[PDB]
Amino acid sequence: SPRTVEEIFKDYSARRAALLRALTKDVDDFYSQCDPEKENLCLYGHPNESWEVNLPAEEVPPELPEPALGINFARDGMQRKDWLSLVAVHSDCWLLSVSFYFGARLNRNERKRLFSLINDLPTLFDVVTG
Amino acid sequence: SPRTVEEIFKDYSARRAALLRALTKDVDDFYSQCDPEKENLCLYGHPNESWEVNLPAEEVPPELPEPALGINFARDGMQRKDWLSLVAVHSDCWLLSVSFYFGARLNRNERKRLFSLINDLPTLFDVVTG
């Protein structure tokens, strides 16, 4: 549904706001929801700025790009800060993938402008790794 | 493993070369391999410029971003050109996601340069939709 650079970037910013909160202010709650004994889980950010840990979407044909899957399985197999960094990079990549999915019909200069806006804030990886 | 802008972009270009071939010169072979009756399939491009239709990777923790899953299931539920366009956009998004996964440690100007190189060729969606 987002189609202009402005619309796509508003959608990006809202989803990123959700994931930022999951990985910082709410990191303890997000961590606990990523139970290694559950089935495969993903971290989603929604355009209403809510984050969600849930099963992967079951959609045919695939619609939005999907976040990294099974992040819960290896939660305790590495230092907590390394697991958080891995989730952060994958969340950065998901946010970028989603925006350029909505942006499939953008022309070359529009793609450049959209990436410029995305590249105006630190990545989640940058935030989480300090 | 790719770490510099040059390394990441070489990896991107090789993977994209593979997907370009799948969606153009080899489109009939790629289409046939995407059997709607098989289990869920994805279109992968490898850095040796080979494309592959296969089951999704089973990796914990998730390593590379994964391509769109189950593209075979809806192959015949839309016009062939629309299915190809959908695969193309998702392949564009996967290629971008992979590069910025390898590029997690790039600084702001490096991210800008990497996207600029990616944005120097038409997207697969642009190629396929003419």
UniProtKB/Swiss-Prot annotation, chains A, B:
One of the record's GO cellular component terms: nucleus
Q: What is this protein called?
A: PHD finger protein ALFIN-LIKE 2
The processes (GO biological process) annotated in the record are: chromatin organization; regulation of DNA-templated transcription
State the family it belongs to: Belongs to the Alfin family.
Covered residues of the complete protein? 10 to 138 of 246
Functional description taken from the UniProt entry: Histone-binding component that specifically recognizes H3 tails trimethylated on 'Lys-4' (H3K4me3), which mark transcription start sites of virtually all active genes.
Going by the entry's taxonomy, the superkingdom of the source organism is recorded as Eukaryota
Q: How does it assemble?
A: Interacts with H3K4me3 and to a lesser extent with H3K4me2.
Q: Which UniProt keywords apply?
A: Acetylation, Chromatin regulator, Metal-binding, Nucleus, Transcription, Transcription regulation, Zinc, Zinc-finger
**Gene Ontology MF terms in the entry:** histone binding; zinc ion binding
Notes concerning its domains: The PHD-type zinc finger mediates the binding to H3K4me3.
- How is expression of this protein distributed across tissues? Ubiquitously expressed.
Q: Where in the cell is it found?
A: Nucleus
